[PDB]
Amino acid sequence: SLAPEDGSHRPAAEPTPPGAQPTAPGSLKAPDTRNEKLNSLEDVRKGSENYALTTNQGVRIADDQNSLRAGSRGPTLLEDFILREKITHFDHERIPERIVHARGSAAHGYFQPYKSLSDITKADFLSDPNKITPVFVRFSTVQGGAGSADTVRDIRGFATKFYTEEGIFDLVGNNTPIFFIQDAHKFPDFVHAVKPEPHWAIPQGQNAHDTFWDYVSLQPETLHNVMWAMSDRGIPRSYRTMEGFGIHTFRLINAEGKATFVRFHWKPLAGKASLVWDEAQKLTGRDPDFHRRELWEAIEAGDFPEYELGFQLIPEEDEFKFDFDLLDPTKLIPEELVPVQRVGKMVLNRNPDNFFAENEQAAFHPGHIVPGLDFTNDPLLQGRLFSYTDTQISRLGGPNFHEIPINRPTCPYHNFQRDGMHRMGIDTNPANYEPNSINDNWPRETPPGPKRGGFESYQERVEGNKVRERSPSFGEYYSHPRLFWLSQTPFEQRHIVDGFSFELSKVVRPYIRERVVDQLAHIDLTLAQAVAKNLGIELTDDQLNITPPPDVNGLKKDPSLSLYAIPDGDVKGRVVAILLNDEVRSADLLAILKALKAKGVHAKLLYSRMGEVTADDGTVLPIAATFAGAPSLTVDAVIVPCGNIADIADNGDANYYLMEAYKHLKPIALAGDARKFKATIKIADQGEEGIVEADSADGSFMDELLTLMAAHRVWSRIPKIDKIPA
Amino acid sequence: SLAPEDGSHRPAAEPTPPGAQPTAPGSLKAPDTRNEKLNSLEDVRKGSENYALTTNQGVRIADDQNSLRAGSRGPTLLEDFILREKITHFDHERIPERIVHARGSAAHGYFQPYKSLSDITKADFLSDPNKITPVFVRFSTVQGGAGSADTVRDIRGFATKFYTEEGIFDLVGNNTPIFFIQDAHKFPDFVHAVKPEPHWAIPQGQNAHDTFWDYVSLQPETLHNVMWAMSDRGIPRSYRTMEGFGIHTFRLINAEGKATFVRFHWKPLAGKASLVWDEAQKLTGRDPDFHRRELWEAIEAGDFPEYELGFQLIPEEDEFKFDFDLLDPTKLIPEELVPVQRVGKMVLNRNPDNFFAENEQAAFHPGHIVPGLDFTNDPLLQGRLFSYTDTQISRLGGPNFHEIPINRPTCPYHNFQRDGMHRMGIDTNPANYEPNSINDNWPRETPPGPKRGGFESYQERVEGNKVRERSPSFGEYYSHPRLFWLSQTPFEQRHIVDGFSFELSKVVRPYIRERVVDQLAHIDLTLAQAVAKNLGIELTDDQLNITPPPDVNGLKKDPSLSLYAIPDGDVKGRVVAILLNDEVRSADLLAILKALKAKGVHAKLLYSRMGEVTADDGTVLPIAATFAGAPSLTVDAVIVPCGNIADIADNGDANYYLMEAYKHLKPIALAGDARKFKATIKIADQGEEGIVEADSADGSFMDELLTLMAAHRVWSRIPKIDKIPA
Amino acid sequence: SLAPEDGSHRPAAEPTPPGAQPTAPGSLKAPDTRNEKLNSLEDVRKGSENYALTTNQGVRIADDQNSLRAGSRGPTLLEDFILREKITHFDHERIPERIVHARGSAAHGYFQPYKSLSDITKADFLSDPNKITPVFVRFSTVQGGAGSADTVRDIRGFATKFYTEEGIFDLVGNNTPIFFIQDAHKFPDFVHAVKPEPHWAIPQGQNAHDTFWDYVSLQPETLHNVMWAMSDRGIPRSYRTMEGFGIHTFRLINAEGKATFVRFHWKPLAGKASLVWDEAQKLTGRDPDFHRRELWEAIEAGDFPEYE
Amino acid sequence: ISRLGGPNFHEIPINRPTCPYHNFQRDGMHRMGIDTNPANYEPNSINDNWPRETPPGPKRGGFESYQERVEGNKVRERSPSFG
């Protein structure tokens, strides 16, 4: 037996904070967390303890350490079927990654509505506040491969599979309310442009290259989502702290046959929070798995990710009332014009058991709708309906991808489809066609109706000639980017300017930079000038005279477009670094930990080596990581307790930890002699907002620290950070 | 409702004779038949009665008769996800067929040994006469595609999957005791030669072409199996009436580690029985699915195929005691030298539910052995071990083919292998490697032992240089073909001559026919001359003087090599055509059927049209088929009762029916005025052996017919048949 | 050398009647028959005479008769890359057959118009009677597998790939002028009904079974093509002696943008001819490759299949 | 066979030998080479046995494995020399 005597190999099957235990498969970490979908997977879950090691054919293996050979230094024999089986399975482990959103992290959970929606939709999963729908959610980046980093600048995917009693509904959205392009025909052009360039396959996880900015400069329809991507929305703090949007206008259909246009929203109950670019970029090197880790850990802690589903609803007769087209996926519907109605709440409360089996193989597709929903003519949505069925044939090996356990409906499914590679279902129906008399026509079509009815499309009127033509109503490109711009706070606007400036500086062909700046001059001259200045470009007189686009139905701003303008801070689940010394004042630590615990904020104890340090009263303190092994990038705030400060005062890593946290606008709190660190970050004696300081870590010290953490970052420190060499 | 009111759409769920009921899926036909494998497939069985028609996502379909279009004469819309799911699944229904043995028919059953064989093998499925092992058996041809015909001349496959408590054991045999080639390296050559020629892909299901005989003429090692293939062995009457052989010498390993050499045998308990060539050929056109049908129908009738497993056993110290090499797969072990020891019984007692899911997807592989068996150095076996794992990666879509339900072990299987296309099992093991401490090293290796132990190879001595060399001991090609020839009856010899003669007639390049005749001169000059003559070839003086090969260890014949030398007829499950007239004598019919029922022989009632006829006494006789629709090819004998014989006396089809049966040596019985039909087949007034005749269909009229049926065909008739124009 | 002294192994590279010579690959049989498409395949045609036997990696093989083994009666060694490459390629030879029309026989040829059609179509291949368009035609049955018999009673497929100067045009037709069903949504139902039944996979190449007639009895729209299949149309004598049809109304469009409705037809210059049922069925047993053989041999003889 | 889709990965252009390659292997997914050999097997008379095996020799000969002596029992055992 190889496990240590003390059982420390095995994580407690209780919720634990990040770092307290090794992470573990969901069914072993939280065996009592159940929902209908998780239970239905039980047929295929395979354990291991107490079982003999076998081939795939069930033959017990005596010696899994050696190939069969003729003498112990001789050649390997072809009759070694144990070796070849094991090697063959290994040799064929990989499947094709997703064409886009290959990098993503998933969890199980459940959803339920706040109130019946049967007045506007007959969808069963929205019909009853006490009917729970299992869900499986995958969050993702867009451009990079499955082994790329999490904290890149990109759009994020937010895909939700609802295993309803009337079929799978997949709501396949992103973290911004519009897309870069109008018609699915251009998707491969756009994606080829954003992806690594085809000669050398560079760069990974980055829009900062010529082809992407070339396409942008030539396709101003992209400018709206480009603005969102260049803002801090492009670098979320966590999948828990971003919005999700279905982007397209869909339809809701009630039992009376009435259609209402809807756009879908997820509101993060943990609040909206993003990183800053220097931090996000360096975090792709220090921990390329930061978002994956953080989501998995939040769930093991009990800090379940929660989202509120919301609908913008527009009656059918109001289709043409806005000064943008509701079917144009590059246009958003301002919440100032159409409020988001809250619809229900989704809680993600268990991680998967096997990433490959459940995450990699999950197939989400926006064509998977249920009665009570329907599509519209959105020309991007229309082409998506073709892609997500078609792509699984190579990705998942064939047309039986719905039989892969994660994908299976929990409701009944019966039909006359047969065969296909890796067919699991053994059909006993004498008939494989309909109409049939030999099985009395079963399974049977079901008329549409109020509940449990067959699917019928809404009978929308279609009147037009067969054309390949963009609707003229889609031909407006600048007003929504401007509305976005004007709705950001001054610091968010600076971050946008810095995002464009950084990205365009990596574009080798200078005319491409110029052409993008010219597009910026059509949105906002202040933005265009600020970017131009960073690129050493001077706007021409004509560019300076470009008339700014019109307001969006009278709006000069909409604060819901900003991450930060309206506070919605939630510290629960956030994490603080506590920089230890070899003689910690235990009275400081006790007060620190008590206040953090009261607000559900986690701590990591850091030192210049691993092992333990002993505090002033004999308490043995285990060290989670070194200053260098768990950098300030990975925490929300830094606290330094008193004690033997001379131990760490001249440690370069400890000093840098504070300089890096300071530059990235994080709250820092310094107790007792830790106040000596004020010098490294140039804080004046009288102190400064964003640095908490006191003789000791009392209740007052922690309240203030906790208040700053609720506001996420110390924006008012931005003018002070260009001086700092960090 | 589309089913008829009287419920006649639904086959009776009880044993019925062939043709009495429509055929049905095995679990609907025989719900009460069970074994441990059939029980374990229950989780994937899908019903159909009383369920709604859905998409694969569980969405109820309202209209499964139309596409979604813009207006009822308008274009189809891309948003029709119900149409595209359904067409996509249809578009990807097919998977590659097997490289060889693509054509095959399969049934579930069970095996039981007669007694424990623990003194000679530790194999668990042979350890206890009470231990019953589920099986799945697939029988097949070799050459033709999945859509080729059953009653071709070819070798047959007889593949058995034993679902043992210690793993899957696949016994992958043929119906002749040798193979055509010695070393696996030549398999693609031989198989390319026998297969349709690569320019034009002709001929299907036939060795009667130039490239096959070219190869054979250049590779005399193939002559042994060619003799079998050219005999009536190449055209079995039924998969129930052929022998099976593992071909190779394998090893049994007992609990003390002692190795015994073994060759595997299957003895058909329904006896040995073949067609004649003209019958077999025509039958590929009248019913290309005859063996598949016959197998399914035997099982639905309760005429379950039964086979006895037997072992020829040779002590290790006897390896070199014979004139041929035990490892040479072109050599048989005469039963006169090493008898077949009976081991156990196998009964196939349930048809599959879905042919594709269970039969097409089944993967058999002779490397799938269990503790208590091991391989030898037979260099054809040796290369087989590589192929049957390899081929599944394309054929079945990847390395998880063991998770396709029909292939799954019923015993436990646990290991560290992960991922791969269409992965079903969701592993919860924190470790995916060993050795590991984080799961205490589970699943763990198991030392070899008397039972329930790990697989260890037998420590055979290997000594020699790395060579691509054939063993000189394999370089004798004629003595076995000669023993086979001399062991055949004179009519079986005639049929061999005529098999070579017909096949060689289809070889377009005359020099190939001559080179084959030259090879036959090395085996037996009588055989060679008879073939030569049918080809217009004259043997040279040299050829006439070739010394015949030596006998095999003193044997100048072994009658176990003959199909018919030793009668072993069983009539149960055979079929008789009864040719009706419009006024049948009912006393004749009652007597016929009563005698047939007593012996388990089935009957089909034929006429010139469908519907019914009424017998002299008013009895209504249902007609199964017309004379033309169910030709004599498909039955084992023909009886014509009295009645209004004038009604059919001038019917070409009815006359021909008798001529065809007469030509193919089948028993024919004629009662009262049905004796008029003697003219059509030119029978003397005093009658002849093989034609039963009498005033009325009893006393001993049925005993005599039933006695002819036990002898299978009327061999004495052979000189009489060249006369008849049929 | 294994060939016979008198060279009778090699068929003459000149047209010869059926059975006179062994049949051969088309470029060895008729080396001077050329068209643009046939010439464009020259980069991928591989010969054989006078070349050494190699692996796929170009390594010359000394002994293509034996695996590598420890002793001449010993076990086969994993390091035998020659054997494993050869057996790997063999083990993966097959690809999925077509879902329908899996059984079919194909030939190269050419098309030429009788006159310019630019009044009714701007299609480039129809613009000038001197425009020669290479074609590749595959004839087929519908129901049976790639390995089933040719002279079954079935509809026949007649597919022509036109390699035009402005794109490939595939005219994918059958030998009757209608289809069994009205709407593509029902194609998997019709095809499952006609194909071998799912419990036992019987029968091959035949509509003569319960599920086919069940569907037909419940879907009267099928009756028209059913009538054609039940006539001697369902049993052609030869792919050379049957009609072809596109079935659908399509449109021609001319340079002015005017649309004309068109249905396509192929008229066989060898005339129309079919077997009788008893002969056809029996022929599926005596020569299940009869139509494939007869097409190949007509072309080798110079009886070129011609269609208008 | 999975990564590159089948047994014809050698016909993907980067992977192709620049020297001659001829054999009796046929078919497989994505088959590019169109073989004109009347024979797809050896030994064959119908194409005078071409392409032909080549004896090993000093230059341009067939591959033959070094005849290293093998001696021992069939074992799954690590050599003690590796320990």
Ligand code: HDD
């Ligand atoms: C016509 C092509 C096409 C277009 C126009 C879109 N996508 Fe898409 N999307 C795909 C074709 C596709 C795909 C190729 O089918 C993917 C990759 C593999 C897969 O399973 O689906 C995919 C994956 C994918 C995923 C990952 C799902 C998962 O986690 O497995 C998300 C979140 C989105 N997409 C979201 C969007 C949004 C919000 C779009 C515009 C509003 C959008 N896609 C446009």
Ligand code: HDD
């Ligand atoms: C080295 C390659 C090789 C050689 C020398 C053999 N075979 Fe084989 N055999 C295969 C390679 C193979 C295969 C390519 O792996 C097949 C085709 C598809 C499959 O799953 O296995 C196969 C299938 C196959 C089947 C069909 C199993 C089923 O019904 O699915 C049978 C009965 C046999 N073989 C029997 C034999 C016997 C008795 C042989 C000589 C003693 C033999 N094979 C030599």
Ligand code: HDD
């Ligand atoms: C909705 C599906 C569907 C429908 C309604 C049809 N087919 Fe089809 N057809 C196919 C789906 C298909 C296919 C599944 O896509 C095939 C099978 C394999 C392939 O490559 O294409 C095919 C093959 C195929 C072939 C063989 C081409 C070849 O030789 O490779 C012919 C001649 C036709 N079809 C002709 C027709 C005609 C004349 C139809 C009715 C007017 C028809 N098909 C309806």
